[PDB]
Ligand SMILES: *[C@@H]1O[C@H](CO)[C@@H](O[C@@H]2O[C@H](CO)[C@@H](O[C@@H]3O[C@H](CO)[C@@H](O)[C@H](O)[C@@H]3O)[C@H](O)[C@H]2NC(C)=O)[C@H](O)[C@H]1NC(C)=O
Ligand SMILES: *[C@@H]1O[C@H](CO)[C@@H](O[C@@H]2O[C@H](CO)[C@@H](O[C@@H]3O[C@H](CO)[C@@H](O)[C@H](O)[C@@H]3O)[C@H](O)[C@H]2NC(C)=O)[C@H](O)[C@H]1NC(C)=O
Ligand SMILES: *[C@@H]1O[C@H](CO)[C@@H](O[C@@H]2O[C@H](CO)[C@@H](O)[C@H](O)[C@H]2NC(C)=O)[C@H](O)[C@H]1NC(C)=O
Ligand SMILES: CC(=O)N[C@H]1[C@H]([C@H](O)[C@H](O)CO)O[C@@](O)(C(=O)O)C[C@@H]1O
């Protein structure tokens with residue numbers, strides 16, 4: 001009469017299915033999820049500096065639409081644009097809107113430094129009922145609408161060197177009247193012109209007279225352009241009409257700043273990773289929440305689940321029933 | 322798996338073993354009993370923890386990127402932006418799929434391997450005093466009281482003590 005010694009391994013009653021090289025489903029004792037598929041629905045306010053645009057696009061904050069004046073000189077890691085945002089100033093377009101939005105978003109700041117431009121022989125600070133500021137007519141805070149003085153609009157010719165050690169961003173524009181009567185009434189000359197240049201490059205814009213669709217009391221338009229002036233370069237502005245002049249420049253930076261479209265509310269919590277759906281944890285290597293992300297995030301994948309086996313093959317006792 | 326212990330020559334697992342992943346069951350004159358083997362259990366867990374920590378190692382931090390949703394039809398530039406993002410997502414989705422498949426195949430094989438390691442270690446310990454039945458059990462050909470079984474399990478079984486007793490019982 002001897003003894004038996006049996007070697008064996010554990011099993012559990014309720015195993016988990018995983019994928020392998022040879023099996024699309026095989027049962028193991030345990031596994032762990034590698035795809036983050038849920039969000040709180042809220043953008044955590046730490047540790048990134050979140051700036052809620054509320055009713056304002058970044059570009060309207062940049063130009064200084066009156067209802068966006070609260071954004072003056074603001075900074076952000078992530079600027080959040082809401083679907084309820086609206087414009088409420090002079091109607092405008094930006095050729096290459098997307099690029100201007102991108103470069104400002106990335107710069108992370110709207111710090112504006114006023115400069116003493118001398119506009120000899122024109123009327124400054126023009127405004128419109130399309131852009132009310134308090135009870136009276138107004139305009140974009142960062143732009144200076146120039147019009148005739150007396151019965152003349154001379155050739156404007158001004159210069160502003162960059163003697164600083166940082167790049168300057170200048171936002172300027174061109175006014176497109178709806179009628180010839182409007183053009184000559186405002187600028188005397190029957191056709192205007194705006195030329196903005198540095199040493200290396202130049203932009204010249206000819207205004208186009210004509211009706212566009214009526215927006216807030218006007219068929220006319222402004223087109224917005226921009227020019228970056230590097231240290232040691234010089235800005236020159238030359239115009240015989242239709243100039244919407246800069247009042248100064250925006251200070252540019254580089255760093256981690258960006259912009260995101262989202263309607264998720266901002267809440268008191270801590271999360272490195274932000275999506276338009278809200279913040280998500282980043283303990284998992286993959287996520288299926290949104291391909292748009294900001295911060296330290298899992299990588300976006302199409303699968304909604306992927307299970308990493310964390311245990312042996314599960315083999316329960318041969319079943320009597 | 323590759324070693325053929327788990328779901329192989331060992332018919333099934335033990336739901337009763339809650340204190341370990343691998344271990345021993347015995348029958349002797351004094352009754353039956355069960356004990357986890359801490360060493361093999363730990364070797365498997367350490368390897369699995371190792372791979373888990375390699376997989377969840379934070380590597381990706383991105384800030385300003387490209388736009389990925391668009392409110393207007395634009396044509397060429399937008400086609401390219403979308404194609405770039407879609408290409409990225411598919412390549413990453415493939416990597417995720419392959420990673421888990423390889424990892425899981427390997428986890429099944431290494432756990433099967435540890436079972437087999439414990440089995441071969443036990444057989445070598447018993448020398449000529451036992452025989453492999455073929456189902457994960459050794460028939461031991463001598464009186465092995467509870468103290469002797471614990472000696473097998475904690476690595477202190479001297480085979481010379483019981484060899485003559487066992488050799489005689491085996492060769493008929
Ligand atoms: C088998 O694997 C699963 C994972 O699929 C394990 O479930 C997880 O168990 C841990 C406990 O170690 C739970 O962690 C929790 O973390 C929170 C937040 O930091 C903490 O406050 C809790 O105290 C807790 O530790 C986690 O909730 C749970 N996850 C899921 C999805 O169920 C399970 O423990 C493993 N089982 C075995 C037997 O190894
Ligand atoms: C419009 O305004 C600009 C800026 O004030 C005028 O450009 C300037 O033109 C003068 C020539 O009349 C340039 O003078 C030169 O300066 C160098 C020193 O760098 C000197 O060595 C030369 O002998 C010469 O005198 C001046 O550099 C230039 N300024 C810039 C920034 O380029 C332009 O002439 C004005 N035109 C009109 C029609 O008003
Ligand atoms: C996060 O938001 C995205 C984008 O809004 C959601 O995906 C959209 O909504 C449904 C989901 O079934 C789809 O039919 C749309 O095609 C999706 N749009 C895009 C642009 O992908 C997504 O479901 C949300 N995820 C979570 C976890 O909230
Ligand atoms: C600088 C200036 O005098 N602007 C005037 C404008 C412009 O003529 C047009 O907006 C050009 O398209 O017209 C107004 O009726 C307006 O818009 O409220 C009155 C305003 O005083």
Ligand SMILES: *[C@@H]1O[C@H](CO)[C@@H](O)[C@H](O)[C@H]1NC(C)=O
Pocket residue numbers: 072073111112113
């Ligand atoms: C913006 O910043 C500049 C310099 O830092 C300052 O001169 C200017 O007045 C600021 N404006 C506001 C509205 O804070």
